[model samples]
Target: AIRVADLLQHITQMKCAEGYGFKEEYESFFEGQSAPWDSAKKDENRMKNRYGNIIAYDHSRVRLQTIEGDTNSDYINGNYIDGYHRPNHYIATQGPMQETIYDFWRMVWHENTASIIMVTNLVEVGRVKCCKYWPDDTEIYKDIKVTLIETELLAEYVIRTFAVEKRGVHEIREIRQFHFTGWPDHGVPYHATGLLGFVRQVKSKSPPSAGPLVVHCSAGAGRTGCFIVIDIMLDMAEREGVVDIYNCVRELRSRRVNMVQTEEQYVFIHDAILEACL
Candidate 1:
């Protein structure tokens, strides 16, 4: 008598960039998480947080099957919904950047959105070398100057691209384009400065030339999420008052994207916020 269930299935392993370990319970599906509105709306199902709030985006256009919360144009509450804009990439239906860009600068504009950061897709970068894998193929190849302009502009002051081949992560070449052009350091010490440079760029750019950075990563989850959270935390501190940094971030998680990646990164953000006060 030999075991069967554990030995079954073609094979087993997960390749998520952030190292998602196996948890029998966390299947990453919309099983019991479906909306309670109508049973027929199975495809529109979503998972709710422990607090009963759905983690689904409001809009259907950008919401992947498993996304949580609404994708409404309204940045209601300033929790910018994460997304991408690759030409044929269907799921993350590139954000309404054009519209946001238009209204982002009006002093009297009262749209719910506060900002947007445009990150160069993996195919647009070239540190580990850009990759181009079409929707119909799994094979990827280097694409040096594919989306160069965007890659060049964004890499400055923001760590947007990551190397899939590398174990940790590599900042694409554009990052240096930004830094060498007088942008701040992205290493541990100057991380916050690097982020503030982005904020300043958004605040200083004239008319439509500048707007809230619509940041996004491959999955629009980790790097993108962290950047937006820290930005929002800073915005809140300036509006209200100051308090413990961890508490501030924890509060952010409570309201927006849940994962913070690491305690070290969180601590760095805390210091960055304090530095901003001065």
Candidate 2:
């Protein structure tokens, strides 16, 4: 019920205590049933999912072209999520696992993905959050070859460029991965400025006509969802001058399970959106 034009002021006022009904409002989205993720539950495909419960819904899930004609080869724990007015603007997925690493590249190539938004690190707090899916120099993941063309490291993030090619294809595509290092697992960043800047860089570099930007975190829903929400709202606020964070998350969950998974993440999105306008 707030205009993006007035969003900064609105958030500023609320932060200073506008008799805040904020927590209660976020609670509505907190407790809700997500759409079914039937395919991800099948016995053979269960191990392919990072988390048993957090899987992509059938309707919006991205289906990979079956490699080697294997049964159920079409599944790859990813969902095609839309942004504001853009359909299939992003493919929200789990960080590539050791087992699913090949499928990850396959999805990237199959979708013609040009930009990758990685919100988690390879390892976090003595845990293997995501496997090292990319090569240090170059490596072939079954049918696709990914070569690390260049890497630019910054304080809070890193931008990596890769030359990607599919089997029997002469053409190579340039794919960039924007990996943010500041965000914590199961938590939000201390300030929203870092993520705001990161999102700006991602939006600027990612081509509008290319395949969907693939975004992921550990589970692919919590931080992945947060990034997507912020991305969608930024565009929505710019063009429409208003935003519906509630409805935006609603639609996102309908596409993928537990998007904006935590209350902290949900709050961080609002904070990020507010900071962006200022």
Candidate 3:
């Protein structure tokens, strides 16, 4: 009789035996779904980026709490993407807009969120991808006060630690932001090592008590979806010694359409997972 670990190893080895060319299988999985794109279009003005769309799943929407004495719109370009074996383990959103910056920090503070994964840069190839939401030092945004205390610059990413304070409240929570600076707009990383290392750094900083990690890029689709799947599948492999790419992508698309937005990204997921195993 074989041990459980050995059995799982055999299964994983079999899954990747042929390798590559799951693009159609991945594309077909999303093609069957009747995605509700109009739901997210209701508040076009609230969206940071027009190209991004949210699925109609009720649980996928992140409702901002009604803060007392606040008149500004609570809507922000964001969604709650469920995690493997966990509900709403991640909040996927677009880069913060100047108008929605307050609401962004509000969501971070209210959710007790500890980690923010920024996969896009402020400006990419002469286009503005994300607004500068965090502060260089201490800056006040509406009811939340943010203080950037430390910064660690890496070859492909930058890690910043922020001390966030909610006005009229006594507690302060430290939030860590892992910003991947190498990915181009509508593209995947040139290599997976940097991304995998970034993911591991984020995991080390993010504990369960910190709530779900907030993940976002320009549209919160493609790159966001790719990162989420890789993170989930790799964790599944470590925990159970196996991975399921199909189901994971399906689960993501069910919550938000156009996740893993391109064939390149879909294939990259497979490649990245294999690289991690090596």
Candidate 4:
């Protein structure tokens, strides 16, 4: 049988390449938002073939990758600056977990967009450190906000960390922290970091929920992808008590248009599961 650990090995072993799908682009969703200069600005491109690693013990402090310019410039509007509404947000990679996830949510809401969910493990995600495929200059990280989350699945709790600052104006909006249960292992891809313990973090923060959380690894498809997928599965389980992770992942690919794109990543997810299950 395809075990979760086996699946995890399959995931961590693979690497993303540059060019091809990596150099892909999409239409400007925030075309008519606010800042014309900032909108549709391609500071950096995502090259799937470009090799990078998303494994760090402290997901909070991973450097992620070598970018072009200052990280300060990366996030545009410091706060909710008055009269400054240029989608003042970006959604991209930031090494491993915590900060990356925290910032992505800010980008999504700041830009008024959404994202796809993939299953990943704590080691490959927020637990340790992970980096982004594109440079920090990439428009996706400019003036963005993200939320950090930790899942101690066994504890059935979710710990949250919202990526935001009070430098400017805008009432300091934050949707940080979620308390839920029943997290599957297939969602996480990396190992090193304890799994269920992270779930407990999620459980402790339960109630007064937050919207979708942005989780990603180097490519945002494999290590990080699995984390996103598992969150979804947890939601499904809330109602149905169970959901097939593979099916949820396949359907996600069909709609949002993204694939984990790794052999080990695909298999490792199956092997790495819950504390009891594993």
Question: For model 3, what is the C-alpha lDDT against the true structure?
Answer: 0.75
Give lDDT tens digits, candidate 3, residues 1-278: 21334544543553463533353465477542244434355654435443644333344667677567753344555677777677889987877778778878988887889999999888887988788999999999977899998999998899999998987899888899999987756567778888988888888778788778889887777788888998988778787767777788878877766678877787777768777876
Q: For residues 1-278, could you state the per-residue lDDT of candidate 4 as single tens digits? A: 22443533433342234322212211211112122222113233122112223211111111222335634323311111010111211122333333444344444354333332222323432343233322222223444433333222334433333434333546434444332222344343245234435443443543323333444434444444444444444444454444455665454343222334454444444444432233
lDDT of 4 at 139: 27
TM-score of 4: 0.41
Query: Model 1 over residues 70-98: C-alpha lDDT tens digits?
Result: 44222211233321221211111122232
- Candidate 2 lDDT: 0.87
lDDT of each: 0.32, 0.87, 0.75, 0.34
Looking at model 3, which ten-residue stretch has the lowest summed lDDT? 1-10
Arrange candidates by lDDT, highest first: which order? 2, 3, 4, 1
User: TM-scores for all candidates?
Assistant: 0.38, 0.94, 0.86, 0.41
The deviation in Å at residue 276 for candidate 1 is 2.1
Candidate 2 per-residue C-alpha lDDT over 1-278 given as tens digits, one digit per residue, 9 for 90 to 100: 57977877766665555425456556776444366777888898988999877887889999988877599988999999997788889999999989999999988988989999999988888899999899989999887999999999987999999999988999999999999998865579989999999999999999888999999998899889899999999888898788788888888888888898777787788899888866
Q: Give one clash count per candidate, in the order shown.
A: 21, 0, 0, 79
